[PDB]
């Protein structure tokens, strides 16, 4: 079929700025066929632009579509706070397909994460498992290295990260890393540490504890 | 004024079938076909197919060819989407949308798109069974000076979702509740954390309230400093 | 107006592709409420003439059937989509009756229908032994015989292929730019009316 | 377009006579034809629509006939007030309704004579270096500018003013 | 059932003017309204139609320059004219449209309002008593009544005569009122 | 009367281009075609090409296949022949010819010829 | 292509359809005139004294022209 590829997957811009989202068709698509949709988190998508350039009802004028052949463009002239969302392009020249999406993200001054580490609760240990939670709180940009070290052993494949959406107020993110060990393994070791590499840090931050101290 | 309102969320074992309804109103039903779009967790939108509300002709995404069945009921302006032979791979939110990309009557291509969308229906495909979470504290660190963070770990529950608030919603400032992560165990887990003044730890009481409705699990877990 | 069975004018006017004039396309409209407000609300109509009815009155009228004929021609040619016209289009492509009842709507479709270095997709009939009767359609591609000599399926002297492609460069003057045409023809037999305005 | 031609452009008849005026569409227009009457200094008034229907309130002496390409308005018994320009208007192709050039119907009165007056320039006019000497022809049938009135509706007479 | 036009006067070439129609005696919102102009030689010309659903229609001659509109709550109709050319000079009638069957016709007209496109300045007429002459004014028209309109019986008012200077001359045999310049003379 | 009228004599220099016209009146020009024939001084006829009036479809001979252009102008009833890259061989008398057409059908040969145009390249 | 040669009659290299073969007459200073078309037909107002004949490669009755197909039209020498 026809594949649409949106680049970049995340576009980071300050409020007020002009956003220029791209959609590239794997072959020539008719300009009548290309639509644009906006999706805020945990919300239905909503139609912005159809027939390449036609605005949907109620859509404000800052949104405008252009392009032809293989390269189409959604443009937001001045990004208002609500305009920060995922945008999907969509063609139906040949069948129907969507683009993988582009998140428009609030660009912000770099802010370093404040790291926290939490030992497994006594309650948890009762029932045979142990979860060590490392929290990176209020950072930007989104990229952060988190490594778990257990008595110097570099862990891998027994931890799972989870990142918030961008914050409403400070436009930052918070990430959690959760190392999961059996009660058995947890007690075979003494020192639990996560080391955080982030752009906002002058050098990486390690936070550790010693078990049962 | 136009509204598509979808049926409740489903939980389905691998192998089963799911039939999601979509109730259109506020517009001539048979003037526009219905399109269905699904969105798996952390993925883009994926088109499934189209139906004429007028003549009942369908056009399905090649991916879902022998597997999906769309129907409509004109009498009650409801659209239906039935996905059979479910794999966990098919866990997604299922949207219906009023379609202006192919005409109901003459089935030809139109200059338009998906006009209005449903609220969505979540379909969870898992071998898992309803299980309420264990809520364990994340006690504020002993080594703490003069901002402190504390939290609740909400572990081993199915299915989505859970509600977490602090002090019955009194404390919302500086709360972060993370997206759930699906564990290899097939159950879900998430953390909620809050950053409070280091000074308030001795007086002010932080008690996270967790609610998992599928399992009638209501936990009010107090998070005290350890030892 | 919250109606349950509404005529597909949207489908007719908002089609992505349009027929060549020689092979003009017709859609029948029946048994539905015809809301012509979607035509009024167009900014983009270059031509909007009605014959035998006022455009301002369409929402008041009932018909047995409406027929939506659509195609693409030159700007210069819209003139010929009218009762009692002559020209290549009126004569050999699409003829209306001298006593036509309906509307002719046209809009500049340069944006959709012209391609750089010509769009040769759109055809019209250039030769025919006679003219068309009203609402006749001729899609045959028999080599036109000019002389008394048979053509034997091939081209040559006095033996020309009956269909020509429009140019349609984006840079053509308005007169040579492509226009999309919709011809609503209202039909009134001695039967119940199936197509009524909301008024 | 569709263009209307009326014939003849001028007509004279006495009160009581039957006037018949012609209109012709440039292509066939069925009974899509209207007739308008315009007395001087007034807006058109609708007499006939649908080639032959008398508008409410129009005197029945007025009639319309014809269909297709050729059309007739007939005043069966002319009256003194029927002095007007008459216009036919096609109503087939809209919204571009088109009107005809118009036919002016004059009245044939009995021969009457002008009661001549002459007005000398005023004192204020002389005080500006203007001299306008006015000569008047009041009631008649049938470096100086002449000004003709339209046929007075009531008594079928003209007037003429000479501005010496 | 009445229609009363207003807005007519002198205007600069390239200039702009808005005509207004005041309808009474009928359900205004129910009927289509139209502007028709009338010119020397070139007869009656349809200028604009507004329907009852915000549909508006114009001939090419005027398309893009004129906008018809209506305020159904103020029983009012409007013609906003831009880029006024010389030949836009006409009497402008506001007219009600109606159909009996498929048959459409203008069933009521206003009194007309005169618009004059000209680079020429307006000048007020001199009024002198004929023991009335109204002389040297631009543009048209002038109106004459006697004693406020107490005496209209036995009154012949002569049509204007375009002079060599380019002004107008008129006689009446009084309250003279030249509106385009504002002149009220007795 | 029925005829084809060409433009007067032309004189150009080697390399340049020339634009001959052929005007028609009388017969229904649209349903016709126009062939172009050249002829040196007291020598044989050679074919240049031909156009169909209605369509504008042109075919050429070998010798000119990329240095000649026959166009037409229906709205003036005029055909044109354009030869570029002139030389010694292009100093000839050029004729246009057409079949008579009368609305529906046409005669089955070139029965209408011009008066001619002498073209000189020296 | 078809190579026409008149003698000292008109011959053709390849076979030529009769429908597309015409004879012409030229006098000094004047343009050619049509005499015979379609191998054996008289032009309008052309005297009876003239007659056309032939088919295949041989044609008998000055110039002979063949005009078969869209392209490859040629004349004889004389
Ligand atoms: C005849 C008709 O309905 N035309 C529609 C118009 O009303 C609508 O605003 C637009 C976008 O959906 O597509 C076209
Ligand atoms: Cl898709
Ligand atoms: Cl129009």
Q: Residue F50 is part of which domain span?
A: 3-121
C-alpha dist (Å) from residue A146 to A120, A131, A143, A162, B193 = 18, 16, 10, 12, 18
Decide if B31 and C4 are in contact by the 8 Å CB cutoff: no
3.40.109.10, 1.10.3470.10, 2.60.40.10, 3.40.640.10: CATH of D115-163:
2.60.40.10
Ligand in closest contact with the CA of B63: 2
Sorted by where each begins, the domain ranges of chain A are 4-106, 114-210
Task: For residue C49, report the distance from its CA to the centre of ligand 3, in Å.
Answer: 5
User: Closest Cα to atom 12, ligand 1: which residue?
Assistant: B112
DSSP annotation of E68 reads: E
- CA-CA distance, E117 to B194, in Å (whole number)? 76
Q: Can the peptide bond before residue B38 be classed as cis, meaning omega within 30 degrees of 0?
A: no
- CA-CA distance, F100 to F111, in Å (whole number)? 7
Residue E94 and residue E177 in one domain? no
Q: Are E167 and E109 in contact (CB under 8 A)?
A: no
E110 to chain D, any CB pair closer than 8 A? The answer is yes
Two tokens, residue B36? 């269905």
- CA-CA distance, A43 to B45, in Å (whole number)? 12
Q: Which residues, 6+ apart, have CB-to-CB distance to E48 below 8 Å?
A: E34, E35, E56, E57, E58, E62, E66, E68, E79
- CA-CA distance, D90 to D28, in Å (whole number)? 10
Residue E82 and residue E154 in one domain? no
- Using the structure block, give the residue that is written with the tokens 């003279």: E176
Nearest residue of C to residue A32, measured between CA atoms? C16
Q: Can the peptide bond before residue D142 be classed as cis, meaning omega within 30 degrees of 0?
A: yes
End-to-end CA distance of chain C: 10
Interface test with D, best of E53, E158, E174 (most D CBs within 10 A): E158
The per-residue DSSP string of D14-26 comes to: -TTS-EEEEEEES
Domain boundary among B125, B144, B169: B125
- Encode chain C in three state secondary structure: CCCCCECCHHHHHCECCCCECCCCEEEEECCEECCCHHHHCCCCCCEEEEECCCHHHHHHCEECEEEEEEEEEEHHHHHHCCCCCCCHHHHHCCCCCCCCCEEEEEEECHHHHCCCCCCCCCEEECCCCCCCCCCCCCCCCCCEECCCCCCCCCCECCEECCEEECCCCCCCCHHHCEEEEEEEEEECCCCCCCEECCC
A2 to chain B, any CB pair closer than 8 A? The answer is no
Residue E54 and residue E85 in one domain? yes
- CA-CA distance, G4 to G8, in Å (whole number)? 13
Region for residue G39 given its phi and psi (left: phi exceeds 0; alpha: psi -120 to 50; beta: otherwise):
left
Decide if B113 and A50 are in contact by the 8 Å CB cutoff: yes
Class of domain A4-106: mainly beta
Q: Which residues, 6+ apart, have CB-to-CB distance to D161 below 8 Å?
A: D134, D135, D136, D137, D146, D147, E158, E171
Decide if A178 and B44 are in contact by the 8 Å CB cutoff: no
Ligand in closest contact with the CA of C39: 1
Residue B168 and residue B215 in one domain? yes
Contacts of F59 in chain G (CB under 8 A): 70-71
Ligand in closest contact with the CA of B101: 1
Question: Least CB-CB distance to B45: which of A45, A56, A123?
Answer: A45
Residue B146 and residue B195 in one domain? yes
Decide if D36 and E163 are in contact by the 8 Å CB cutoff: no
3-state SS assignment for residue E168 = strand
- CA-CA distance, E113 to A121, in Å (whole number)? 91
Q: What are phi and psi of C175, to 5 degrees?
A: -55, -30
Chain A nearest C-alpha distance from C9 (Å): 18
Query: b/e map of D127-162 (b: 16 or more CB within 10 Å)?
Result: eeeeebebebbbebbeeeeebebebbeeebbbbbbe
Residue E93 and residue E143 in one domain? no
Distance of CA D113 to the CA centre of its chain: 23
DSSP annotation of B175 reads: E
What CATH number should be reported for the domain holding residue F99? 2.60.40.10
Pick the closest to residue E93 from E178, E179, E160, E8 (CA basis): E8
Chain G nearest C-alpha distance from F35 (Å): 10
Q: Which helix (H) or strand (E) holds D126?
A: helix D123-126
Residue C137 buriedness (CB in 10 A; 0-12 / 13-18 / 19+): middle
DSSP annotation of B158 reads: B
Residue E71 and residue E131 in one domain? no
* Total number of domains in chain E: 2
Q: What ligand 1 atom has the least distance to the C-alpha of B111?
A: 13
Contacts of C17 in chain B (CB under 8 A): 108-109
Q: Looking at the structure, give the CATH architecture of the domain made up of residues A114-210.
A: Sandwich (2.60)
Pick the closest to residue B49 from B5, B80, B90 (CA basis): B80
Nearest residue of F to residue C164, measured between CA atoms? F55
Q: What are phi and psi of C75, to 5 degrees?
A: -55, -45
In a domain, B227, yes or no: no
2.60.40.10, 3.10.20.30, 2.40.40.20, 2.40.50.140: CATH of D4-107:
2.60.40.10
Q: Which residues, 6+ apart, have CB-to-CB distance to B42 below 8 Å?
A: none
C-alpha dist (Å) from residue B175 to A106, A211, B27, B152, B164 = 20, 27, 42, 11, 10
- Encode chain A in three state secondary structure: CCCEECCCCEEEECCCCCEEEEEEEEEEECCCCCEEEEECCCCCCEEEEECCCEECCCCCCCEEEEEEEEEEEEEECCCCHHHCCEEEEEECCCCCEEECCEEEEECCCCECCEEEEECCCHHHHHCCEEEEEEEEEEEECCCCEEEEEECCEECCCCEEEEECCCCCCCCCEEEEEEEEEEHHHHHCCCEEEEEEECCCCCCCEEEEEECCC
Q: Which residues, 6+ apart, have CB-to-CB distance to D158 below 8 Å?
A: D137, D140, D141, D142, D148, D149, D150, D151, D152
Q: What is the CATH number of domain C9-194?
A: 3.30.70.1840
Region for residue D74 given its phi and psi (left: phi exceeds 0; alpha: psi -120 to 50; beta: otherwise):
beta
Q: Judge F/C contact: 3 or more CB pairs < 8 A.
A: yes
B62 to chain A, any CB pair closer than 8 A? The answer is yes
Contacts of C37 in chain B (CB under 8 A): none
Helical segments of chain G, H only: none
Residue B77 and residue B46 in one domain? yes
Residue E69 and residue E148 in one domain? no
Q: Which residues, 6+ apart, have CB-to-CB distance to D43 below 8 Å?
A: E93, E95, E109, E110, E111, E112
End-to-end CA distance of chain E: 34
Contacts of G20 in chain C (CB under 8 A): 156-157
- CA-CA distance, D1 to E59, in Å (whole number)? 11
Q: What are phi and psi of D103, to 5 degrees?
A: -120, 125
Interface test with B, best of A126, A139, A162 (most B CBs within 10 A): A162
Q: Are B106 and C27 in contact (CB under 8 A)?
A: yes
A117 to chain B, any CB pair closer than 8 A? The answer is yes
């Amino acid at each position: 079929e026809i594949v649409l590829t949106q680049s970049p997957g995340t576009l980071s811009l300050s409020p007020g700025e002009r956003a220029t989202l791209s959609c590239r068709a794997s072959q020539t698509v008719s300009s009548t066929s290309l639509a644009w949709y906006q999706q805020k988190p945990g919300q239905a998508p909503r139609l912005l632009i159809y027939g390449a350039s036609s605005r949907a009802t109620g859509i404000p004028d800052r949104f405008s579509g252009s392009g032809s052949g293989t390269d189409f463009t959604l443009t937001i002239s001045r990004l208002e706070p609500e305009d920060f969302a995922v945008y999907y392009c969509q063609q139906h020249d040949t069948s129907l397909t969507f683009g993988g999406g582009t998140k428009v993200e609030i660009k912000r001054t770099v802010a370093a994460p404040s790291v926290f580490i939490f030992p497994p609760s006594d309650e948890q240990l009762k029932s045979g498992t142990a979860s060590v939670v490392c929290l990176l709180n209020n950072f930007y940009p989104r990229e952060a290295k988190v490594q778990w070290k257990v008595d110097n052993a570099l862990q891998s494949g027994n931890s799972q990260e989870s990142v918030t959406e961008q914050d409403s107020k400070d436009s930052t993110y918070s990430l959690s890393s959760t190392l999961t060990l059996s009660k058995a393994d947890y007690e075979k070791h003494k020192v639990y540490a996560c080391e955080v590499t982030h752009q906002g840090l002058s050098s990486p931050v390690t936070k550790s504890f010693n078990r049962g101290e | 004024q136009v509204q598509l309102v979808q049926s409740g969320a489903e939980v389905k074992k691998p192998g089963a079938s799911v039939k999601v309804s979509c109730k259109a109103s506020g517009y001539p039903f048979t003037s526009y076909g219905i399109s269905w779009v699904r969105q798996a967790p952390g993925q883009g939108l994926e088109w499934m197919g189209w139906i004429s509300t007028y003549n009942g002709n369908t056009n399905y995404a090649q991916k879902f060819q022998g597997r999906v069945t769309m129907t409509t009921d004109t009498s009650t302006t409801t659209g239906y989407m039935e996905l059979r032979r479910l794999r966990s791979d098919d866990t997604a939110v299922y949207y219906c949308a009023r379609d202006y990309t192919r005409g109901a009557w003459f089935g030809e291509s139109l200059i338009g798109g998906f006009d209005n969308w449903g609220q969505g229906t979540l379909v969870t495909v898992s071998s898992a069974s309803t299980k309420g979470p264990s809520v364990f504290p994340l006690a504020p660190s002993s080594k703490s000076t003069s901002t402190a963070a504390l939290g609740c770990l909400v572990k081993d529950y199915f299915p989505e979702p859970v509600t977490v608030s602090w002090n019955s919603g009194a404390l919302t400032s500086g709360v972060h509740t993370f997206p759930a992560v699906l564990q290899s165990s097939g159950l879900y887990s998430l953390s909620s954390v809050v950053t409070v003044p280091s000074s308030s730890l001795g007086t002010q009481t932080y008690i996270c309230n967790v609610n998992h409705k599928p399992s009638n699990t209501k936990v009010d877990k107090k998070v005290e400093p350890k030892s | 107006p919250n109606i349950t069975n509404l005529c597909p004018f949207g489908e007719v006017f908002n089609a992505t592709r349009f027929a060549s004039v020689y092979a003009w396309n017709r859609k029948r409209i029946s048994n539905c409420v015809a809301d012509y407000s979607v035509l009024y609300n167009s900014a983009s109509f270059s031509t909007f003439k009605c014959y035998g009815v006022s455009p301002t009155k369409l929402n008041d009228l009932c018909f047995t059937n409406v027929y939506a004929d659509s195609f693409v021609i030159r700007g210069d040619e819209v003139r010929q989509i009218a009762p009692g016209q002559t020209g290549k289009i009126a004569d050999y492509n699409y003829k209306l009756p001298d006593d036509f009842t309906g509307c002719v709507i046209a809009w500049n479709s340069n944006n959709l229908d012209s391609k750089v270095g010509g769009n040769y997709n759109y055809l019209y009939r250039l030769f025919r032994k006679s003219n068309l009767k009203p609402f006749e359609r001729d899609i045959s591609t028999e080599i036109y015989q000019a002389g008394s000599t048979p053509c034997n399926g091939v081209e040559g002297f006095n033996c020309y292929f009956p269909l020509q492609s429009y140019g349609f460069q984006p840079t053509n003057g308005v007169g040579y730019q492509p226009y999309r045409v919709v011809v609503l023809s209202f039909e009134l037999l001695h039967a119940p009316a199936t197509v009524c305005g909301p008024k």
